Amino acid sequence: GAMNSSNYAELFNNDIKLFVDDTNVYRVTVHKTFEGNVATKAINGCIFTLNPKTGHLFLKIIHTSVWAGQKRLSQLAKWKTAEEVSALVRSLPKEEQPKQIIVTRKAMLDPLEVHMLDFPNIAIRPTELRLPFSAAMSIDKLSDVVMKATEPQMVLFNIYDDWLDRISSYTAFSRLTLLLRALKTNEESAKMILLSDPTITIKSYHLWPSFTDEQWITIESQMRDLILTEYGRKYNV
Amino acid sequence: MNTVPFTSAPIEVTIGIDQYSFNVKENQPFHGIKDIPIGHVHVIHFQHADNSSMRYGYWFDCRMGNFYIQYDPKDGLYKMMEERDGAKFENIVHNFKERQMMVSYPKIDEDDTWYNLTEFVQMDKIRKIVRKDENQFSYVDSSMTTVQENELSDPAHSLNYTVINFKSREAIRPGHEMEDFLDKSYYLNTVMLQGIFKNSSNYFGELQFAFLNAMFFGNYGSSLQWHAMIELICSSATVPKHMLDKLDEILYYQIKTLPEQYSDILLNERVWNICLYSSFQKNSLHNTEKIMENKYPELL
């Protein structure tokens, strides 16, 4: 059943699993028409498919063309996500295919289950965790490849850069969830914290800056501070 | 006008015949049921006064043989049996009738209730759902599980209803996942009607049989099958008009006949709310929607 705080260590065991977030698949700007009605214009989306153990991110870019002449787009977006995840699994060699897929939103369960009927041994699970994978489009390099796509494209990233050389998956996932929670709660503040010192750069093959172990502790502290403030404001407490 | 004689009534028991029922006392000189209408299936059913658990009964059709009930003190139940000796049977029945030890099937002339509940139900179809080929009649009870319930354990004592599963490769064509999940017309029309049932009559007969097993025996798996077969039609955008008109009539008499006090366990809130208010056929079941709203508005 559902993935929660009780069974959190299971993310870092040696059973291949993938998180699927569909929250940036269907993206619109709402605007006024000449006649003063409202209309949406779609922009490029992405499926966020992450192995929490390895950091391997399968970023399937959703070009606005897939929505051309379709109806009920927020419904179609769930089934399109399930089609692409299904296609990714079948593209992987057998020994690489996941034994579990965890969807961040329960509305993905039936679409993904129906698309994965050919794979009865792959468990489709919800989670009770409120994971901040929606903020993936605040990572500059992920945002850049999505907006520039002129066609459907799959791009492979390691969202942990080289962190697993020095820390465990558990710590890398905690660091990632803290960065994404910060970026989601106050993007401008979070990005300032990450780039404020010009001497620490992002390697061409990386998403995040090349922080020393000590610099990461400072950064992680600055992110926890940002999140608590914003919470005090949100709630006046 | 056919007769099911009883050898005796050694234990106190509530006897059902179709939608009617009668209390019989321990060793009461009760010798059976006469004036049973020819042309329909019938069910005779039992609930012991001492164990209000295990409702059980026999589906039969008097055109297929001479049937009687005898209590078995070893297995502890009223058993249906066939009498192959025609002249013995006519002679048994005529005696009990002369002595007036038989209750009359109490049908009002105006009353099409039982016809309306059994319109498409055939004994030959019942005998394929309830497999005991040495008998012309079929035993059902409260506890018998379905082939589908058994997959999720004695196959011989199972109800072999047609397996319906909305999240199955049978239900979903490769490449038509979203279309076939949201619009079950292909599953209803090609797989089930053309493929397995052959015609809407066989489909309706199974649906009506699942209802009556749910109602008369509190059979939980039968209740699941009745809802699944309603839901497959209501969730199909493309259903023949004659099928929708007949479904409305079928469900109307089922809802009309349901004891008022069993709507809490026999009716599935999700399926009924979906079928009457959200589904493709939300506007196609006028009679059923009117009786449901006037009799069970809490459920909706």
Interface residues on B facing A, Cβ-Cβ cutoff 8 A: 167-169, 172, 174, 177-178, 181
The CATH number assigned to the domain holding A23 equals 3.30.420.230
Return the structure tokens found at B153: 């354990």
Task: Identify from A117, A118, A122, A124 which residue to disrupt to test chain B contact, counting B C-beta atoms within 10 A and taking the largest count.
Answer: A117
- Nearest C-alpha neighbor of B206 from the set B129, B107, B291: B129
Residues in chain B with CB shorter than 8 Å from the CB of A82 are: 177
Residues in chain A with CB shorter than 8 Å from the CB of B177 are: 79, 82-83, 111, 114-115
Question: Could you tell me the residue ranges of all domains in chain B?
Answer: 1-143, 144-300
CATH code of the region B144-300: 1.25.40.550
Domain boundary among A102, A134, A163: A163
Task: Answer yes or no: do B178 and A76 touch at CB < 8 A.
Answer: yes
- Assign 3-class secondary structure to chain B: CEEEEECCCCCCEEEEECCEEEEECCCCCCCEEEEECCCCCEEEEEEECCCCCCCEEEEECHHHCCEEEEEECCCCEEEEEECCCHHHHHHHHHHHHHCCCCEECCCCCCCCHHHHHHCCCCHHHHHHHCCCCCCCCEEEECCCCEHHHHHCCCHHHCECCCCCCCCCCCCCCCCCHHHHHHCCHHHHHHHHHHHHHCCHHHHHHHHHHHHHHHHHHCCHHHHHHHHHHHHHHHCCCCCCHHHHHHHHHHHHHHHHHCCHHHHHHHCCHHHHHHHHHHCCCCCCCHHHHHHHHHHCCCCC
Instruction: List the determination method.
Output: X-ray
Domain ranges, residue A173: 164-237
Domain boundary among A163, A181, A200: A163
Task: Answer yes or no: do B181 and A114 touch at CB < 8 A.
Answer: yes
Quote the Cα angle for B236-B238-B242, to 5°.
Answer: 105
CATH code of the region B1-143: 2.60.34.20
Residues B288/B282, Cβ–Cβ less than 8 Å: no
Resolution in Å, one decimal place: 1.6
